[PDB]
Design a protein around this ligand. Sequence first.
Ligand SMILES: *[C@@H]1O[C@H](CO)[C@@H](O)[C@H](O)[C@H]1NC(C)=O
Ligand SMILES: *[C@@H]1O[C@H](CO)[C@@H](O)[C@H](O)[C@H]1NC(C)=O
Ligand SMILES: *[C@@H]1O[C@H](CO)[C@@H](O)[C@H](O)[C@H]1NC(C)=O
Ligand SMILES: *[C@@H]1O[C@H](CO)[C@@H](O)[C@H](O)[C@H]1NC(C)=O
Ligand SMILES: [Fe+3]
Lengths: 10, 646, 362, 185
Amino acid sequence: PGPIGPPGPR
Amino acid sequence: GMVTPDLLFAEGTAAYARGDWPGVVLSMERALRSRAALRALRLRCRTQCAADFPWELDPDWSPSPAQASGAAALRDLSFFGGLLRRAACLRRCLGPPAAHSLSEEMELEFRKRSPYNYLQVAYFKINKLEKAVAAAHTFFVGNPEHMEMQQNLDYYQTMSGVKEADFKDLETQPHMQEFRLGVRLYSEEQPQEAVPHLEAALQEYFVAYEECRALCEGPYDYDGYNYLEYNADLFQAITDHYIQVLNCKQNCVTELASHPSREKPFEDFLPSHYNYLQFAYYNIGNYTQAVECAKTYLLFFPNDEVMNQNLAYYAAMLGEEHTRSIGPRESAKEYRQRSLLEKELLFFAYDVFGIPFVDPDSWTPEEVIPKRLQEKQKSERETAVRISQEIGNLMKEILDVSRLTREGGPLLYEGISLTMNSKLLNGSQRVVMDGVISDHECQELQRLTNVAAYGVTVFKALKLGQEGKVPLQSAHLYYNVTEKVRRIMESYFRLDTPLYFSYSHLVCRTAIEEVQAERKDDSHPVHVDNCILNAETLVCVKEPPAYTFRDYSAILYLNGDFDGGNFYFTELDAKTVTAEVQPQCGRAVGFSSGTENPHGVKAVTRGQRCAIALWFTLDPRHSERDRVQADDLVKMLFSPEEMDLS
Amino acid sequence: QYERYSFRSFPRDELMPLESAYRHALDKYSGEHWAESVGYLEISLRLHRLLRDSEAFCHRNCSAAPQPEPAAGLASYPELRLFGGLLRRAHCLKRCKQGLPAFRQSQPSREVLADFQRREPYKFLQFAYFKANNLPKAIAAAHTFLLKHPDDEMMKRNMAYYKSLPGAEDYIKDLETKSYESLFIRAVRAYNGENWRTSITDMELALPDFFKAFYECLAACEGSREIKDFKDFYLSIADHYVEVLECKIQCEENLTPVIGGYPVEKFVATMYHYLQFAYYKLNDLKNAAPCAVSYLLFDQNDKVMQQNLVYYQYHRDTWGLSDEHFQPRPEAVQFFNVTTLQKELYDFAKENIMDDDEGEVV
Amino acid sequence: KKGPKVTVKVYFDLRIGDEDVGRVIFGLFGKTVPKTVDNFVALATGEKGFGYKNSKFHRVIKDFMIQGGDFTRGDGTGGKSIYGERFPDENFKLKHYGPGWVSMANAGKDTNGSQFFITTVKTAWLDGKHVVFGKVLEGMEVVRKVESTKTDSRDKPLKDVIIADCGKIEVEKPFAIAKEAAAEN
Ligand SMILES: *[C@@H]1O[C@H](CO)[C@@H](O)[C@H](O)[C@H]1NC(C)=O
Ligand SMILES: *[C@@H]1O[C@H](CO)[C@@H](O)[C@H](O)[C@H]1NC(C)=O
Ligand SMILES: *[C@@H]1O[C@H](CO)[C@@H](O)[C@H](O)[C@H]1NC(C)=O
Ligand SMILES: *[C@@H]1O[C@H](CO)[C@@H](O)[C@H](O)[C@H]1NC(C)=O
Ligand SMILES: [Fe+3]
């Protein structure tokens, strides 16, 4: 359904 | 396993406190032997690893077309193969590397010969008076300003059991003793007994020089906590370390020529050996060695008039064919050639990387110094002569002599006014000036220190401005004002020597109103920036724990919107107050950091106090190391220069 | 994000530190602002490429230079010659670095440089592209990250979803591609299609490019280290080099092309194998023999090439060959020497230099 | 995973005024940092008269660390090593990876004395300044109990914390450990 994106560190 | 010296020394000191004389004798003797054994071990494997794997040389590099890159790679691989082989050999002797490291307080304790003090007391207490007198004489030779040692030696000598010949030095190097003995015998006009001692001294000198040169490859010297921001790539790290090692090897020359009895090293040590030898040989009646020694002296100073006269007289007394047959000594030739090559390398590094080098020899020809350094040296000579002439004229126009010959100054810049001179400040080497900088500069520097937050150095401020955290105009202004203060303070005090930086930081002090309860104690005790203040006996001791190279001090204040925070000059007893200055905007107080100016700062009751503190040196060896990097950064950031990328 | 890139003329508009551009990009990424994050990530990628190219250009002027011959006396003191040469090279490097625009900004930390080397930023990039209706660039960035790391969990799911998408079966391309990779692919295609001169031209173009890239990669590994012990001169100069040597050893494998998800093994020997067959089919054994000798140099356990060598050897007089046409090409010999020396030095130093103060946890 | 090898173990018994709250076992890295393990072991065994026996923790700052090891003066200004008074820093080969890593407390550069601290949270701002030489092996619950005692404005615990005993436990075979946090069941 939706590609997984990384959690934003900053 | 050769227990380290400091553990044994601590055991001995504790036993001395308790009152166990066998304990102190056993422990202190063990400490001395352990230090000697560790030194011999280091010397032995450094020499052995050098002699097993000699350096190779294939400098026939070929820039073959489309083959320069691989050839460079293979050359580097040859060099680093050799280096790794030597490192493996060194590692497989030396053993545990923890044993060869000890603090600097212990090194100071060992260089002053304290264990011999302890040992002489112990030996006397357990009736071994011969060893007692030997230890006492060794300690006395080490420290010549002890009347207590003198009376102890008197007491020992009056007592039956010991003679004059018992006085044997257990610590001084053999070549120095041989030289001093031979020179004394020469001064009594006994040339027959002078030549063998002097020749022995020459041989010992060369052996000891080789031994000292091999102990100079130690750890790199990061200046404080700057190992956490060291970012040198491989070929720059190697270069920094090697330049330091070479500098140490060259400074071994001035260390082999010093004795604790004298306050300065002998001048022209090795050529002086030859100078004595030639006349002694002449007085004996051996002319061949006389002309040989004259010829080996002339190889160091080739234009001397007196030695040339002596050689001409000898040659007239001799035959010309014999004189043209003989030449100088070969050990002297090898010595001189190696020294010249090392000095060339060190002067090149000084010219290019800005790493200072102070020559320990006065026989160096001028051809080994690049042109920029020669121009700088000429300028320094000219300014020294000018200052001396000015002082002579002023003394012709003549405490008060001190208050006059070394206090008036031109005050180069405009707007700078002499608010209080030394007489109005009750002392010597004191001044308070006003208007060093304006109000806008003060505001800008205040912003620089408020945003970056409290000691911030000029190099750190420049880096912060480069990143973007602080404005860059502020960092450049900080650099400018520091250099301006240095120039004005060097011109005021009539200095013929150049003045170098030592340290500088920008600091802000805040008052906390919730910790002011019952705060009757002073914020900071009276101190002296040079040595440690022992107010108990009203003396000062210049010791390596203190910064003994600092010579002048200066402070400039940037705001006056607070209460408290005064600056006062005080007497040595640390109680009475001699003078006080009121901080304001652009006010600078400058003084000599010696023992004649003890100073103190009060507590701030409320507000903000921000100023710059500066310390200067007269010794070029002890210059601020971060100032070279800051200079490079300023040149890069504000005076760019491209290199034709096309 | 590499169309408007030129080393000679880099816009002064976007000259900022690499760390600050990366920080701004991640700040906008966490702020759910996609367009600005795309712009800043592209800026940071271009800045990293500029830094790498500036370092390569600087290391070429200095190290690869003709040598000054010093006087006759200095020939009797080898240590002074060696370290004086090192001193001169260090001075040339420092002087050359001040004039280049990329070195007058603030230099990045080792963590950020390793982070960029591991191709991490591309992760963020692909997601951002999807949120800005840039599906072709999204799949391209996903493929570029996946190419270096093939065992990631989330990226495989992302690539499966992307491949499910219609049309997006022909935009798959590597954004961090090299010259010799494309030249090799073209030459292989020509060889497979029964055409020899085109393959010869492309392979002969591809070989020196690989060698130049290899030597620049070797020269870029001689970086800094972090200080954590204080040892003597020879014992600390030889600890810096051991880290440098680990990095250098792990350097021929990173430049190998990947086709079909599997790296091509024995790259240089493969090039010579192709070249030899192509030259044979043109009956130009004058060039076919040295390639065969080079291949046998790199891989000594191939019966096929040894039989080919026997075949060439026995027909020496028919085709008028000389012994001068039976030695390996010099560039291959240089490559062989460098790689073998590096492996021998590292194996030696992993027994005598490196301390044993650690072990495996059980 | 690669980790440092422990060579000696030492044990402390702690008492909060009147309760005995337990025993703590430290494992020291003697092949990485010698001359700092030796000072600790010699002072724990008390083989030279002076030692850690009947000493006291004087800083129990919450959620940071617990510090002790001043046996000469009650405050934090005393303490001496076996190599004189102070000795230089050796090497920063290890960092503060988490709770339970023992390190040497110093008042500047090259001023290691006899005072140590046990970190309770990860402290990465201390790396490169303080030298780390051990890791807590057992009794993390006792460290947690000591960390939560009531303090004052200067962090001096209201009830005294006493090292009622200290000794040394020998290890026949060095073994490696994991470079992460410790215990915390
Ligand atoms: C001069 O001295 C050398 C060495 O000291 C000696 O060999 C030589 O015989 C001496 N000459 C005379 C005339 O005694
Ligand atoms: C610092 O001094 C230099 C030299 O005169 C000058 O060019 C520059 O403008 C100054 N920087 C300031 C005033 O911020
Ligand atoms: C290195 O750069 C300088 C700077 O202009 C240039 O003059 C010199 O020719 C360069 N060296 C080589 C080998 O190209
Ligand atoms: C390079 O390798 C070849 C192949 O054996 C050898 O003949 C040559 O001596 C080597 N060159 C070196 C190690 O410099
Ligand atoms: Fe002061």
